[PDB]
Amino acid sequence: KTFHRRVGDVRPARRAMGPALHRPVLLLWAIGQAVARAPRLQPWSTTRDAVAPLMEKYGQVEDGVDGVRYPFWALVRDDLWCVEQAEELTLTSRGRRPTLESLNAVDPSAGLREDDYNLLRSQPEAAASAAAGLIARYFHLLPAGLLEDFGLHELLAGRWPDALRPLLGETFKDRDAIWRAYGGQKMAGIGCLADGILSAFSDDKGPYADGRIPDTTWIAYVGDGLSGDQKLTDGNELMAEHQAVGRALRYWHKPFQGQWSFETWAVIVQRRLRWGLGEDKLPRREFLWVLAPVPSPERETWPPEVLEALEADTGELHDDTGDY
DNA sequence: CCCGGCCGGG
DNA sequence: CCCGGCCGGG
C-alpha cells in the first residue's frame, strides 16, 4: 500500500541481458516532473518524445520511442501509474499494452497516482528516497549524464544516498522490530527491505566475536542455506547479482545479546566455498561472501584499496572444499 | 513498418 | 498459471 513499498516492489525480472529499465526510467522521470511542479497527468505524445531520449541513453535500449509504450501501460498495475480514457484504447496480444495507433489516435493523459502527486510535491524527503532507491537499485554508477537530465540534480546534490533510510547506526531489538520499520522479511540473513535494497544480517553467536577476517580489512559473511550444502538460490543469488555489478548492500550486525544495528554499507569482493557446520551440526558445503565495507553506495566515496580488490576479483567462486 | 504471438522469468 | 518487453512474419 505505502508508496514507499510499491516503488520498492518494482522489480523487473532478471532477463539474461540485464533487467528491463523501462519501468524505472519512467518512474524516475515522473518524480523529476513532480519535483519540477509539472502537471500531474500528461498526454502520451508529449511524454513519449520527452522520455525516449533518456530511455536510449539510460535504459540502454535501441528504439527509445517504442520503448515507452510498455511501461506507459504496465506501470498501472504496479499501482503507481494511472491512465484516463482506458476503455477507448484498442488492445493487442490478449490483455497487453494497446496498439501504437490507438495511442497516437487517442492521446491519453497518463500520470502518477493521486496521493503520490500530493506526497511528492508536498514532501521532498519522500521524493528524495524514491529516486535514491531506483538510482541505487537500477543505475548506481551515476554517470554524470542523468543527474541533471532525470530531474534531480538540485534534489539530490552532494551525497545522493543521504536520502535513504535507515541511517547508519540505527538500532533495533528484534529482527522483527526492524521489519515494522523497514519491511522485507524476518528470514534469511539475506533479503531486501520494503525499499527494494539488499540487506545482509549477521547474528553473532559468541561474545567478543564478530565476522572480521583476521589480519584484514574485510568481513566474512556466510551464505544463507541453513543445514546442508548451500545453493545459488534466493539470498545467495542476490549476493551473486550484486557481486557481478559491484553493487553495495546494507550490513546489519547484532553483537550478541545486543541490539541489531545498521553498521555499514559493504560490497562483495570475493565468493568462496567452504566446509562448515549446519544447524543440524553436520558438515556441509557453504558460501563465504567476503565483504569490504564502504562509507556509502556512492562509488566516489570508496577507498582505493576497495577498488583494487574488485578490480582484482575474478567474480568466480573459489572452492576451498579441497583442503579444510 | 507496427498487429500479434513468442519468449522466458516469476 | 501469470505478464512485459522481444522479435518474427504478415
Residue numbers in the entry: 95 to 418
Task: Please quote the paper that reports this structure.
Similar to the FL ScoMcrA protein, ScoMcrA‒SBD-SRA forms a dimer, with the SRA domain mediating dimerization but no association with PT-DNA. Although there are sulfur atoms in both strands of PT-DNA, which contain a palindromic GPSGCC core sequence, only one sulfur atom in PT-DNA is recognized by ScoMcrA-SBD in both structures. In support of these structural observations, both FL ScoMcrA and ScoMcrA-SBD interacted with hemi-PT-DNA, which has only one of the two DNA strands phosphorothioated, as shown in EMSA assays (lane 5 in Fig. 1a and Supplementary Fig. 5). By combining the structures of FL ScoMcrA and SBD-SRA in complex with PT-DNA, we obtained a model of FL ScoMcrA dimer recognition and cleavage of PT-DNA, which agrees well with our cleavage data. Our model suggests two ScoMcrA might not bind to two strands of one DNA at the same time.
